[PDB]
Amino acid sequence: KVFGRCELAAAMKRHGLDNYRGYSLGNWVCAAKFESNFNTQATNRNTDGSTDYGILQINSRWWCNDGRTPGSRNLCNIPCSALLSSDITASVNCAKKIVSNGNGMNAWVAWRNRCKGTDVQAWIRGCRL
Ligand SMILES: CC(=O)N[C@@H]1[C@@H](O)[C@H](O[C@@H]2O[C@H](CO)[C@@H](O[C@@H]3O[C@H](CO)[C@@H](O)[C@H](O)[C@H]3NC(C)=O)[C@H](O)[C@H]2NC(C)=O)[C@@H](CO)O[C@H]1O
Ligand SMILES: [Cl-]
Ligand code: NA
Protein backbone atom coordinates (compact mmCIF):
# COMPACT_ATOMS: atom_id res chain seq x y z
CA LYS A 1 0.00 0.00 0.00
CA VAL A 2 1.24 3.50 -0.88
CA PHE A 3 0.09 5.87 1.85
CA GLY A 4 -0.87 9.46 1.43
CA ARG A 5 1.08 11.98 3.57
CA CYS A 6 -1.76 12.96 5.95
CA GLU A 7 -3.14 9.42 5.85
CA LEU A 8 0.19 8.09 7.13
CA ALA A 9 0.47 10.88 9.73
CA ALA A 10 -2.95 9.95 11.09
CA ALA A 11 -2.14 6.21 11.29
CA MET A 12 1.21 6.86 13.02
CA LYS A 13 -0.40 9.22 15.50
CA ARG A 14 -3.08 6.66 16.26
CA HIS A 15 -0.34 4.09 16.84
CA GLY A 16 1.29 6.44 19.37
CA LEU A 17 4.32 7.67 17.43
CA ASP A 18 3.69 11.37 17.98
CA ASN A 19 6.47 12.43 20.39
CA TYR A 20 7.49 8.84 21.06
CA ARG A 21 10.87 9.15 22.88
CA GLY A 22 10.76 12.89 22.19
CA TYR A 23 10.37 12.59 18.41
CA SER A 24 7.54 14.63 16.97
CA LEU A 25 5.22 13.15 14.31
CA GLY A 26 6.86 15.18 11.52
CA ASN A 27 10.11 13.19 12.09
CA TRP A 28 8.40 9.84 11.51
CA VAL A 29 6.51 11.01 8.42
CA CYS A 30 9.71 12.54 7.01
CA ALA A 31 11.62 9.30 7.75
CA ALA A 32 8.96 7.17 5.98
CA LYS A 33 8.95 9.50 2.95
CA PHE A 34 12.68 9.20 2.27
CA GLU A 35 13.07 5.63 3.46
CA SER A 36 10.29 4.08 1.37
CA ASN A 37 8.37 6.89 -0.29
CA PHE A 38 5.37 5.78 1.83
CA ASN A 39 5.32 2.29 0.22
CA THR A 40 4.70 -0.54 2.71
CA GLN A 41 6.09 -3.12 0.23
CA ALA A 42 9.52 -1.45 -0.29
CA THR A 43 12.56 -3.71 0.04
CA ASN A 44 16.25 -2.99 -0.41
CA ARG A 45 19.26 -5.26 -0.18
CA ASN A 46 22.48 -4.20 1.57
CA THR A 47 26.10 -5.27 0.90
CA ASP A 48 26.39 -7.30 4.10
CA GLY A 49 23.62 -9.57 2.77
CA SER A 50 20.85 -8.15 4.94
CA THR A 51 17.67 -6.53 3.57
CA ASP A 52 15.60 -3.49 4.66
CA TYR A 53 11.81 -3.97 4.81
CA GLY A 54 8.71 -1.84 4.69
CA ILE A 55 7.64 1.72 5.18
CA LEU A 56 10.44 2.33 7.73
CA GLN A 57 13.01 0.09 6.01
CA ILE A 58 13.75 -2.06 9.06
CA ASN A 59 16.97 -4.11 8.74
CA SER A 60 17.07 -7.93 8.78
CA ARG A 61 20.51 -8.22 10.38
CA TRP A 62 19.04 -6.95 13.66
CA TRP A 63 15.26 -6.59 13.82
CA CYS A 64 13.39 -9.27 11.87
CA ASN A 65 13.89 -12.71 10.39
CA ASP A 66 13.88 -13.24 6.63
CA GLY A 67 15.58 -16.62 6.79
CA ARG A 68 18.52 -15.51 4.62
CA THR A 69 20.62 -13.16 6.79
CA PRO A 70 23.21 -15.56 8.31
CA GLY A 71 23.77 -14.86 11.96
CA SER A 72 21.35 -12.02 12.43
CA ARG A 73 19.34 -11.03 15.45
CA ASN A 74 15.57 -10.93 15.42
CA LEU A 75 15.07 -8.27 18.07
CA CYS A 76 11.46 -7.50 17.10
CA ASN A 77 10.65 -11.27 17.03
CA ILE A 78 8.84 -11.20 13.71
CA PRO A 79 9.37 -12.41 10.17
CA CYS A 80 10.39 -9.47 7.93
CA SER A 81 7.37 -10.16 5.67
CA ALA A 82 5.11 -8.91 8.49
CA LEU A 83 6.69 -5.45 7.91
CA LEU A 84 5.39 -5.25 4.32
CA SER A 85 1.69 -5.33 5.30
CA SER A 86 -0.70 -2.49 4.44
CA ASP A 87 -1.32 -2.39 8.21
CA ILE A 88 1.64 -0.53 9.78
CA THR A 89 1.13 -1.90 13.27
CA ALA A 90 4.02 -4.37 13.05
CA SER A 91 6.38 -1.71 11.64
CA VAL A 92 5.41 0.81 14.29
CA ASN A 93 5.85 -1.68 17.11
CA CYS A 94 9.28 -2.63 15.91
CA ALA A 95 10.24 1.03 15.29
CA LYS A 96 9.42 1.80 18.89
CA LYS A 97 11.95 -0.80 20.06
CA ILE A 98 14.58 0.48 17.60
CA VAL A 99 14.30 4.13 18.67
CA SER A 100 14.12 3.10 22.33
CA ASN A 101 17.85 2.43 22.36
CA GLY A 102 20.89 2.51 20.20
CA ASN A 103 21.23 6.00 18.79
CA GLY A 104 17.56 6.92 18.61
CA MET A 105 16.32 7.93 15.17
CA ASN A 106 19.90 8.03 13.85
CA ALA A 107 19.23 4.30 13.16
CA TRP A 108 17.44 5.54 9.98
CA VAL A 109 20.05 6.82 7.54
CA ALA A 110 17.48 8.80 5.47
CA TRP A 111 16.32 10.53 8.67
CA ARG A 112 19.84 11.42 9.74
CA ASN A 113 20.71 12.77 6.27
CA ARG A 114 17.45 14.39 5.09
CA CYS A 115 15.18 15.09 8.12
CA LYS A 116 17.37 15.71 11.16
CA GLY A 117 17.72 19.43 11.80
CA THR A 118 15.10 20.46 9.22
CA ASP A 119 11.58 21.84 9.82
CA VAL A 120 9.95 18.42 10.16
CA GLN A 121 6.69 20.06 11.22
CA ALA A 122 6.01 20.90 7.54
CA TRP A 123 5.41 17.15 6.88
CA ILE A 124 2.13 17.31 8.78
CA ARG A 125 0.94 20.65 7.45
CA GLY A 126 -2.73 20.78 6.44
CA CYS A 127 -3.53 17.41 8.02
CA ARG A 128 -6.49 16.73 10.27
CA LEU A 129 -5.03 14.74 13.19
C1 LIG B 1 15.92 1.05 10.77
C2 LIG B 1 17.09 0.09 10.89
O1 LIG B 1 16.90 -1.13 10.81
N1 LIG B 1 18.29 0.62 11.13
C3 LIG B 1 19.47 -0.23 11.23
C4 LIG B 1 20.23 0.05 12.53
O2 LIG B 1 19.49 -0.46 13.62
C5 LIG B 1 21.63 -0.61 12.53
O3 LIG B 1 22.40 -0.08 13.62
C6 LIG B 1 22.88 -0.96 14.58
O4 LIG B 1 21.80 -1.24 15.47
C7 LIG B 1 22.19 -2.04 16.60
C8 LIG B 1 20.93 -2.31 17.41
O5 LIG B 1 20.39 -1.10 17.93
C9 LIG B 1 23.24 -1.31 17.42
O6 LIG B 1 23.64 -2.12 18.54
C10 LIG B 1 23.48 -1.55 19.79
O7 LIG B 1 24.40 -0.45 19.90
C11 LIG B 1 24.27 0.24 21.16
C12 LIG B 1 25.16 1.47 21.09
O8 LIG B 1 24.57 2.47 20.26
C13 LIG B 1 24.57 -0.72 22.32
O9 LIG B 1 24.44 -0.03 23.57
C14 LIG B 1 23.58 -1.88 22.25
O10 LIG B 1 23.79 -2.80 23.31
C15 LIG B 1 23.73 -2.58 20.89
N2 LIG B 1 22.79 -3.68 20.78
C16 LIG B 1 23.16 -4.84 20.24
C17 LIG B 1 22.10 -5.94 20.17
O11 LIG B 1 24.29 -5.05 19.79
C18 LIG B 1 24.45 -0.99 16.57
O12 LIG B 1 25.32 -0.14 17.29
C19 LIG B 1 24.03 -0.26 15.31
N3 LIG B 1 25.18 -0.17 14.43
C20 LIG B 1 25.48 0.99 13.83
C21 LIG B 1 26.70 1.01 12.92
O13 LIG B 1 24.82 2.01 14.00
C22 LIG B 1 22.36 -0.31 11.24
C23 LIG B 1 23.71 -1.02 11.12
O14 LIG B 1 23.54 -2.41 10.89
O15 LIG B 1 21.56 -0.73 10.12
C24 LIG B 1 20.36 0.03 10.01
O16 LIG B 1 19.70 -0.38 8.87
CL1 LIG C 1 17.01 10.15 21.39
NA1 NA D 1 17.70 -11.30 11.52
PDB file of C-alpha atoms and ligand atoms in Angstrom:
ATOM      1  CA  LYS A   1       0.000   0.000   0.000  1.00  0.00           C
ATOM      2  CA  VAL A   2       1.243   3.504  -0.876  1.00  0.00           C
ATOM      3  CA  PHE A   3       0.094   5.870   1.850  1.00  0.00           C
ATOM      4  CA  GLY A   4      -0.871   9.455   1.432  1.00  0.00           C
ATOM      5  CA  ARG A   5       1.077  11.975   3.566  1.00  0.00           C
ATOM      6  CA  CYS A   6      -1.756  12.964   5.954  1.00  0.00           C
ATOM      7  CA  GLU A   7      -3.138   9.423   5.845  1.00  0.00           C
ATOM      8  CA  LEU A   8       0.189   8.088   7.134  1.00  0.00           C
ATOM      9  CA  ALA A   9       0.475  10.881   9.729  1.00  0.00           C
ATOM     10  CA  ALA A  10      -2.951   9.950  11.093  1.00  0.00           C
ATOM     11  CA  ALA A  11      -2.136   6.211  11.290  1.00  0.00           C
ATOM     12  CA  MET A  12       1.206   6.859  13.017  1.00  0.00           C
ATOM     13  CA  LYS A  13      -0.395   9.224  15.500  1.00  0.00           C
ATOM     14  CA  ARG A  14      -3.077   6.655  16.256  1.00  0.00           C
ATOM     15  CA  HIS A  15      -0.344   4.088  16.843  1.00  0.00           C
ATOM     16  CA  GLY A  16       1.292   6.437  19.375  1.00  0.00           C
ATOM     17  CA  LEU A  17       4.316   7.666  17.430  1.00  0.00           C
ATOM     18  CA  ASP A  18       3.691  11.369  17.982  1.00  0.00           C
ATOM     19  CA  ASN A  19       6.469  12.432  20.394  1.00  0.00           C
ATOM     20  CA  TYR A  20       7.486   8.843  21.059  1.00  0.00           C
ATOM     21  CA  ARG A  21      10.868   9.155  22.879  1.00  0.00           C
ATOM     22  CA  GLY A  22      10.760  12.891  22.190  1.00  0.00           C
ATOM     23  CA  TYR A  23      10.374  12.593  18.413  1.00  0.00           C
ATOM     24  CA  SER A  24       7.538  14.625  16.974  1.00  0.00           C
ATOM     25  CA  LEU A  25       5.215  13.152  14.312  1.00  0.00           C
ATOM     26  CA  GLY A  26       6.862  15.182  11.520  1.00  0.00           C
ATOM     27  CA  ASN A  27      10.115  13.195  12.088  1.00  0.00           C
ATOM     28  CA  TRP A  28       8.400   9.840  11.506  1.00  0.00           C
ATOM     29  CA  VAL A  29       6.513  11.012   8.421  1.00  0.00           C
ATOM     30  CA  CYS A  30       9.714  12.536   7.013  1.00  0.00           C
ATOM     31  CA  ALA A  31      11.617   9.303   7.754  1.00  0.00           C
ATOM     32  CA  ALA A  32       8.961   7.171   5.979  1.00  0.00           C
ATOM     33  CA  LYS A  33       8.950   9.499   2.948  1.00  0.00           C
ATOM     34  CA  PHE A  34      12.680   9.200   2.268  1.00  0.00           C
ATOM     35  CA  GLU A  35      13.072   5.628   3.462  1.00  0.00           C
ATOM     36  CA  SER A  36      10.289   4.076   1.367  1.00  0.00           C
ATOM     37  CA  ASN A  37       8.369   6.887  -0.291  1.00  0.00           C
ATOM     38  CA  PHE A  38       5.366   5.784   1.832  1.00  0.00           C
ATOM     39  CA  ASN A  39       5.322   2.294   0.224  1.00  0.00           C
ATOM     40  CA  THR A  40       4.701  -0.543   2.711  1.00  0.00           C
ATOM     41  CA  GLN A  41       6.090  -3.117   0.226  1.00  0.00           C
ATOM     42  CA  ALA A  42       9.522  -1.451  -0.293  1.00  0.00           C
ATOM     43  CA  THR A  43      12.563  -3.712   0.042  1.00  0.00           C
ATOM     44  CA  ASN A  44      16.246  -2.991  -0.406  1.00  0.00           C
ATOM     45  CA  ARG A  45      19.262  -5.259  -0.178  1.00  0.00           C
ATOM     46  CA  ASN A  46      22.477  -4.205   1.574  1.00  0.00           C
ATOM     47  CA  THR A  47      26.101  -5.268   0.898  1.00  0.00           C
ATOM     48  CA  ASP A  48      26.385  -7.296   4.102  1.00  0.00           C
ATOM     49  CA  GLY A  49      23.620  -9.570   2.774  1.00  0.00           C
ATOM     50  CA  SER A  50      20.849  -8.149   4.935  1.00  0.00           C
ATOM     51  CA  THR A  51      17.669  -6.528   3.573  1.00  0.00           C
ATOM     52  CA  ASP A  52      15.604  -3.493   4.655  1.00  0.00           C
ATOM     53  CA  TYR A  53      11.811  -3.966   4.808  1.00  0.00           C
ATOM     54  CA  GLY A  54       8.706  -1.839   4.694  1.00  0.00           C
ATOM     55  CA  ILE A  55       7.643   1.716   5.178  1.00  0.00           C
ATOM     56  CA  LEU A  56      10.440   2.327   7.727  1.00  0.00           C
ATOM     57  CA  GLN A  57      13.014   0.090   6.011  1.00  0.00           C
ATOM     58  CA  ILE A  58      13.747  -2.063   9.059  1.00  0.00           C
ATOM     59  CA  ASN A  59      16.973  -4.113   8.740  1.00  0.00           C
ATOM     60  CA  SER A  60      17.071  -7.933   8.779  1.00  0.00           C
ATOM     61  CA  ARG A  61      20.508  -8.225  10.376  1.00  0.00           C
ATOM     62  CA  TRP A  62      19.038  -6.947  13.662  1.00  0.00           C
ATOM     63  CA  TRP A  63      15.265  -6.594  13.824  1.00  0.00           C
ATOM     64  CA  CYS A  64      13.395  -9.268  11.867  1.00  0.00           C
ATOM     65  CA  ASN A  65      13.890 -12.706  10.394  1.00  0.00           C
ATOM     66  CA  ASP A  66      13.883 -13.243   6.626  1.00  0.00           C
ATOM     67  CA  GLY A  67      15.577 -16.625   6.786  1.00  0.00           C
ATOM     68  CA  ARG A  68      18.515 -15.512   4.620  1.00  0.00           C
ATOM     69  CA  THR A  69      20.622 -13.164   6.786  1.00  0.00           C
ATOM     70  CA  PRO A  70      23.214 -15.563   8.307  1.00  0.00           C
ATOM     71  CA  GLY A  71      23.767 -14.864  11.955  1.00  0.00           C
ATOM     72  CA  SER A  72      21.346 -12.025  12.425  1.00  0.00           C
ATOM     73  CA  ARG A  73      19.339 -11.029  15.447  1.00  0.00           C
ATOM     74  CA  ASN A  74      15.565 -10.927  15.422  1.00  0.00           C
ATOM     75  CA  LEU A  75      15.067  -8.271  18.074  1.00  0.00           C
ATOM     76  CA  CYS A  76      11.465  -7.499  17.104  1.00  0.00           C
ATOM     77  CA  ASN A  77      10.654 -11.265  17.026  1.00  0.00           C
ATOM     78  CA  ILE A  78       8.835 -11.199  13.705  1.00  0.00           C
ATOM     79  CA  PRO A  79       9.373 -12.411  10.169  1.00  0.00           C
ATOM     80  CA  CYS A  80      10.388  -9.470   7.929  1.00  0.00           C
ATOM     81  CA  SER A  81       7.368 -10.155   5.672  1.00  0.00           C
ATOM     82  CA  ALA A  82       5.108  -8.912   8.487  1.00  0.00           C
ATOM     83  CA  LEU A  83       6.690  -5.454   7.909  1.00  0.00           C
ATOM     84  CA  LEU A  84       5.389  -5.247   4.318  1.00  0.00           C
ATOM     85  CA  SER A  85       1.687  -5.334   5.296  1.00  0.00           C
ATOM     86  CA  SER A  86      -0.704  -2.489   4.437  1.00  0.00           C
ATOM     87  CA  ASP A  87      -1.318  -2.386   8.205  1.00  0.00           C
ATOM     88  CA  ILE A  88       1.641  -0.531   9.780  1.00  0.00           C
ATOM     89  CA  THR A  89       1.126  -1.901  13.271  1.00  0.00           C
ATOM     90  CA  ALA A  90       4.024  -4.368  13.047  1.00  0.00           C
ATOM     91  CA  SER A  91       6.382  -1.707  11.636  1.00  0.00           C
ATOM     92  CA  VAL A  92       5.413   0.808  14.292  1.00  0.00           C
ATOM     93  CA  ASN A  93       5.853  -1.683  17.111  1.00  0.00           C
ATOM     94  CA  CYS A  94       9.282  -2.629  15.910  1.00  0.00           C
ATOM     95  CA  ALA A  95      10.240   1.027  15.285  1.00  0.00           C
ATOM     96  CA  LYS A  96       9.420   1.803  18.890  1.00  0.00           C
ATOM     97  CA  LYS A  97      11.952  -0.798  20.060  1.00  0.00           C
ATOM     98  CA  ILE A  98      14.579   0.476  17.596  1.00  0.00           C
ATOM     99  CA  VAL A  99      14.295   4.133  18.670  1.00  0.00           C
ATOM    100  CA  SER A 100      14.120   3.095  22.326  1.00  0.00           C
ATOM    101  CA  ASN A 101      17.851   2.425  22.357  1.00  0.00           C
ATOM    102  CA  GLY A 102      20.894   2.513  20.205  1.00  0.00           C
ATOM    103  CA  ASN A 103      21.230   5.996  18.793  1.00  0.00           C
ATOM    104  CA  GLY A 104      17.565   6.924  18.611  1.00  0.00           C
ATOM    105  CA  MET A 105      16.321   7.926  15.167  1.00  0.00           C
ATOM    106  CA  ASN A 106      19.903   8.026  13.845  1.00  0.00           C
ATOM    107  CA  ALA A 107      19.229   4.297  13.159  1.00  0.00           C
ATOM    108  CA  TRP A 108      17.438   5.536   9.983  1.00  0.00           C
ATOM    109  CA  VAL A 109      20.052   6.818   7.535  1.00  0.00           C
ATOM    110  CA  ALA A 110      17.483   8.798   5.469  1.00  0.00           C
ATOM    111  CA  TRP A 111      16.317  10.529   8.674  1.00  0.00           C
ATOM    112  CA  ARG A 112      19.844  11.421   9.741  1.00  0.00           C
ATOM    113  CA  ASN A 113      20.712  12.774   6.267  1.00  0.00           C
ATOM    114  CA  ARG A 114      17.449  14.390   5.093  1.00  0.00           C
ATOM    115  CA  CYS A 115      15.185  15.088   8.118  1.00  0.00           C
ATOM    116  CA  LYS A 116      17.367  15.714  11.163  1.00  0.00           C
ATOM    117  CA  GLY A 117      17.723  19.431  11.796  1.00  0.00           C
ATOM    118  CA  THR A 118      15.096  20.458   9.215  1.00  0.00           C
ATOM    119  CA  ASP A 119      11.584  21.840   9.817  1.00  0.00           C
ATOM    120  CA  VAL A 120       9.955  18.419  10.156  1.00  0.00           C
ATOM    121  CA  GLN A 121       6.686  20.064  11.218  1.00  0.00           C
ATOM    122  CA  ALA A 122       6.007  20.898   7.536  1.00  0.00           C
ATOM    123  CA  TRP A 123       5.411  17.151   6.876  1.00  0.00           C
ATOM    124  CA  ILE A 124       2.126  17.314   8.781  1.00  0.00           C
ATOM    125  CA  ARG A 125       0.935  20.650   7.454  1.00  0.00           C
ATOM    126  CA  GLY A 126      -2.731  20.781   6.443  1.00  0.00           C
ATOM    127  CA  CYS A 127      -3.528  17.408   8.024  1.00  0.00           C
ATOM    128  CA  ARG A 128      -6.494  16.726  10.266  1.00  0.00           C
ATOM    129  CA  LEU A 129      -5.034  14.737  13.192  1.00  0.00           C
TER     130      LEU A 129
HETATM  131  C1  LIG B   1      15.920   1.050  10.772  1.00  0.00           C
HETATM  132  C2  LIG B   1      17.089   0.086  10.886  1.00  0.00           C
HETATM  133  O1  LIG B   1      16.898  -1.130  10.813  1.00  0.00           O
HETATM  134  N1  LIG B   1      18.285   0.618  11.129  1.00  0.00           N
HETATM  135  C3  LIG B   1      19.468  -0.228  11.228  1.00  0.00           C
HETATM  136  C4  LIG B   1      20.234   0.054  12.531  1.00  0.00           C
HETATM  137  O2  LIG B   1      19.488  -0.461  13.617  1.00  0.00           O
HETATM  138  C5  LIG B   1      21.626  -0.608  12.532  1.00  0.00           C
HETATM  139  O3  LIG B   1      22.403  -0.082  13.616  1.00  0.00           O
HETATM  140  C6  LIG B   1      22.881  -0.958  14.576  1.00  0.00           C
HETATM  141  O4  LIG B   1      21.796  -1.243  15.468  1.00  0.00           O
HETATM  142  C7  LIG B   1      22.187  -2.040  16.601  1.00  0.00           C
HETATM  143  C8  LIG B   1      20.932  -2.309  17.415  1.00  0.00           C
HETATM  144  O5  LIG B   1      20.388  -1.098  17.927  1.00  0.00           O
HETATM  145  C9  LIG B   1      23.240  -1.307  17.419  1.00  0.00           C
HETATM  146  O6  LIG B   1      23.642  -2.121  18.538  1.00  0.00           O
HETATM  147  C10 LIG B   1      23.476  -1.547  19.787  1.00  0.00           C
HETATM  148  O7  LIG B   1      24.397  -0.452  19.897  1.00  0.00           O
HETATM  149  C11 LIG B   1      24.271   0.244  21.158  1.00  0.00           C
HETATM  150  C12 LIG B   1      25.158   1.470  21.093  1.00  0.00           C
HETATM  151  O8  LIG B   1      24.574   2.467  20.264  1.00  0.00           O
HETATM  152  C13 LIG B   1      24.572  -0.715  22.322  1.00  0.00           C
HETATM  153  O9  LIG B   1      24.445  -0.033  23.567  1.00  0.00           O
HETATM  154  C14 LIG B   1      23.575  -1.881  22.247  1.00  0.00           C
HETATM  155  O10 LIG B   1      23.789  -2.799  23.311  1.00  0.00           O
HETATM  156  C15 LIG B   1      23.731  -2.577  20.890  1.00  0.00           C
HETATM  157  N2  LIG B   1      22.790  -3.678  20.775  1.00  0.00           N
HETATM  158  C16 LIG B   1      23.160  -4.843  20.239  1.00  0.00           C
HETATM  159  C17 LIG B   1      22.104  -5.937  20.173  1.00  0.00           C
HETATM  160  O11 LIG B   1      24.288  -5.052  19.792  1.00  0.00           O
HETATM  161  C18 LIG B   1      24.449  -0.988  16.566  1.00  0.00           C
HETATM  162  O12 LIG B   1      25.318  -0.138  17.288  1.00  0.00           O
HETATM  163  C19 LIG B   1      24.031  -0.263  15.305  1.00  0.00           C
HETATM  164  N3  LIG B   1      25.181  -0.165  14.427  1.00  0.00           N
HETATM  165  C20 LIG B   1      25.481   0.986  13.832  1.00  0.00           C
HETATM  166  C21 LIG B   1      26.702   1.010  12.921  1.00  0.00           C
HETATM  167  O13 LIG B   1      24.820   2.013  13.996  1.00  0.00           O
HETATM  168  C22 LIG B   1      22.362  -0.314  11.237  1.00  0.00           C
HETATM  169  C23 LIG B   1      23.706  -1.020  11.123  1.00  0.00           C
HETATM  170  O14 LIG B   1      23.542  -2.414  10.891  1.00  0.00           O
HETATM  171  O15 LIG B   1      21.557  -0.735  10.121  1.00  0.00           O
HETATM  172  C24 LIG B   1      20.359   0.027  10.014  1.00  0.00           C
HETATM  173  O16 LIG B   1      19.699  -0.385   8.866  1.00  0.00           O
HETATM  174 CL    CL B   2      17.010  10.148  21.387  1.00  0.00          CL
HETATM  175 NA    NA B   3      17.699 -11.296  11.519  1.00  0.00          NA
END
